[PDB]
């Protein structure tokens, strides 16, 4: 394998392109990178644990990995309070140790092992143009991916459960016993409009639906893996697609960009898979919590929060949504589709219920609204929390902000990568990725436009 | 300090409303656009002058031949955008003319601002909003924003004037 520009045609800054047809060294690069990923998981988790203050809420400490563990129902109890730090520590250590095994394997394959696996094995040797084998690899991975989804299912059903923020009697780890197998609900979720009030799959709001989804996902992924191992690409797909390593990279880049945008939206809007007791309030929650907090204060001062018109003529604390639902007043009117386990007790069939808002408020609801309102996912780049005009004494940026901003940026740059590699794969398949041939420049044989 | 100067010119001079600044914005943004589109067009109409994927090595500074196809570029942009450069000399002059002209025009506007000769207001809309309290535009909203900036920034930004503005006279909307 050439490791210079004269032997490969690729400069040092495009050096990893020299691995396109070196399957052994490419496999080494891949396993060592996987090692990097697992290393970060373990090391960052151990950092978060060493920096963790167990009594202080998770979203106040710059944590993004321990919230993921706690949502899975490890190390936490009711309302997300930490019972034991050891499960987080164990998760970190196991990732950190496995990272070394993957690093070794990667450095081995990248440096010492065969540069090309074609000779060595028919099983591991692949040619980019060999559609049957590339679909075999798709299939083996689809079966492991579906197995991982079923691993989530098993943890939620048979191995202690997962954190259900919607649990009766307060949020807590719950064992899911009736996951939603009904394909109408599960796939209906896929068919919901990605706009306010519906939210496509972002609006999944119960662990039963999430778990039933992962049973379907595991089943569909395992079936698709078996299909791809026992089949070959059909004619229409053989004709509409580019069959090359860079092409497959560009396809995966498009998929990754889509998933990055989706993850950004998920963490920003959904509080079921991302519980607010770990991730802090969504911005919709913080706005509604502000409206609620001053609803309670003013009501306790004796105001009629129902019949109090604001300076504009709309109700100061309560109004109607454009479809008539009773909602919180003020600019929060935009977040009237927000659902939260501390709010939903005060909602009637018509929306917010006056009888409930006048008699059934609880101190935990007021405390929760105060906490969520003061932890609005608003903050500066140097982590000065609250609105940008505030002074420097509050060190807080929401984990939702960090995760959403990061994955939007990564999704966008991966869309750019998709375009880069998809256009390059197309041009290289067609044979003009290196520039225009002077003798057969196509425009010289095309008629003038005018 | 520059950011303060920028916001000061917004709040006191309504400098975004100034046509001279607008011509400057057009010049600078058009200069960036021209830079990006020329670079990209040239890089993507390159002649195949070498065997490597690294197309950069396929250029000799002393070569007599153009390194990219102007005909292909012209056809591409003619069919994409409707028009295209067909004279490279005019293209490179235009790349100088646009940003330079924008800087000159913005400078003319700034010279106006030296004397408080500002495009601050549209008097027609001020007279109407004065007489018609239902009438609102984005222009009137920006006027309000400027009044807020001025009142809240003057005492600290101009400490020598000893501006004592008690809290009750500070303009502000409801709640906020």
């Amino acid at each position: 394998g050439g490791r210079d520009l004269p032997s490969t045609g690729f400069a040092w800054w495009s050096g990893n392109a020299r691995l396109i047809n070196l399957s052994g060294k490419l496999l080494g690069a891949h396993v060592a990178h996987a090692g990097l990923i697992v290393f970060w998981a373990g090391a960052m988790t151990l950092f978060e644990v060493a920096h963790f203050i167990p009594e202080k809420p998770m979203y106040e400490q710059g944590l993004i990995l321990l919230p993921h563990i706690a949502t899975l129902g490890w190390g936490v109890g009711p309302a997300g309070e930490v019972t034991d730090i050891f499960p987080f520590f164990v998760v970190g250590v196991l990732h950190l140790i496995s990272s070394a095994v993957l690093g070794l394997g990667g450095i081995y394959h990248a440096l010492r092992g065969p540069e090309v696996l074609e000779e060595y094995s028919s099983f591991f040797g692949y040619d980019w143009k060999d559609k049957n084998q590339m679909t075999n690899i798709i299939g083996y991975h689809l079966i492991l991916l579906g197995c991982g989804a079923l691993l989530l299912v098993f943890k939620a059903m048979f191995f202690g459960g997962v954190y259900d923020t919607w649990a009766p009697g307060g949020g807590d780890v719950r064992v899911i016993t009736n996951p939603t197998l009904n394909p109408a609900i599960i796939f209906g979720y896929l068919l919901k409009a990605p706009f306010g009030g519906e939210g496509w799959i972002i609006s999944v709001n119960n662990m039963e639906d999430i778990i039933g989804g992962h049973i379907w996902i595991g089943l569909i992924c395992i079936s698709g893996g078996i299909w791809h191992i026992l089949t070959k690409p059909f004619g229409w797909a053989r004709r509409a697609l580019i069959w090359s390593g860079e092409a497959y990279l560009s396809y995966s880049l498009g998929a990754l960009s889509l998933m990055g945008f989706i993850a950004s939206v998920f963490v920003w809007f959904n509080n079921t898979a991302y519980p607010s007791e770990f991730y802090g309030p969504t911005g919709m929650e913080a706005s509604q919590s502000q409206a609620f907090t001053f609803l309670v204060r003013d009501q306790r001062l004796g105001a009629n929060i129902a019949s109090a018109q604001g300076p504009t003529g709309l109700g100061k604390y309560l109004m109607r949504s454009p479809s008539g639902e009773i909602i919180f007043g003020g600019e929060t009117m935009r977040f009237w589709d927000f659902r939260g386990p501390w709010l939903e007790p005060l909602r009637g069939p018509n929306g917010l219920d006056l009888d409930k808002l006048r008699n059934d408020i609880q101190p935990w609801q007021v405390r929760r609204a105060a906490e969520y309102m003061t932890h609005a996912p608003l903050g500066s780049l140097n982590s000065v929390g609250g609105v940008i005009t505030d002074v420097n004494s509050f060190n807080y940026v929401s984990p939702r902000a960090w995760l959403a901003t990061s994955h939007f940026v990564l999704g966008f740059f991966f869309l750019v990568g998709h375009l880069w590699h998809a256009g390059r794969a197309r041009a290289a398949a067609a044979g003009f990725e290196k520039g225009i041939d002077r003798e057969t420049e196509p425009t010289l044989f095309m008629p003038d436009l005018d | 300090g520059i950011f303060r100067f920028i916001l000061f010119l917004q709040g006191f001079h309504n400098w975004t409303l100034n046509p001279f600044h607008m011509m400057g914005v057009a010049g600078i943004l058009g200069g960036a656009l021209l830079c990006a589109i020329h670079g990209a067009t040239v890089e993507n109409t390159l002649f195949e002058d070498g065997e490597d994927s690294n197309t950069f090595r396929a250029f000799e500074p002393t070569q007599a031949e153009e390194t990219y196809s102007m005909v292909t570029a012209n056809r591409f942009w003619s069919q994409i955008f409707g028009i295209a450069f067909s004279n490279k000399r005019w293209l490179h002059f235009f790349m100088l003319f646009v940003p330079v002209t924008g800087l000159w025009m913005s400078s003319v506007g700034i010279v106006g601002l030296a004397l408080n000769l500002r495009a601050y207001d549209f008097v027609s809309q001020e007279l109407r909003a004065a007489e018609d309290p239902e009438f609102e535009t984005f222009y009137t909203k920006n006027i309000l924003l400027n009044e807020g900036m001025r009142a809240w920034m003057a005492p600290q930004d101009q400490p020598h004037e000893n501006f004592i503005f008690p809290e009750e006279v500070l303009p502000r909307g409801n709640a906020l």
């Binding site: 003038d448 436009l449 005018d450 | 005909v71 012209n74 003619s78 409707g82 028009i83 295209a84 067909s86 027609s124």
Partner: peptide, 30 residues
């Protein structure tokens, strides 16, 4: 009536665009 002035100048701009595209000087290889 200032509305008439604004629409007229905008229309002049758009019509210039149409003519510049539909009836441009045809680039020729010489």
């Amino acid at each position: 009536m200032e509305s008439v002035a604004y629409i007229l100048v905008l229309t002049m701009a758009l019509a210039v665009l149409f003519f510049a595209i539909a009836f441009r000087e045809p680039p020729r290889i010489e």
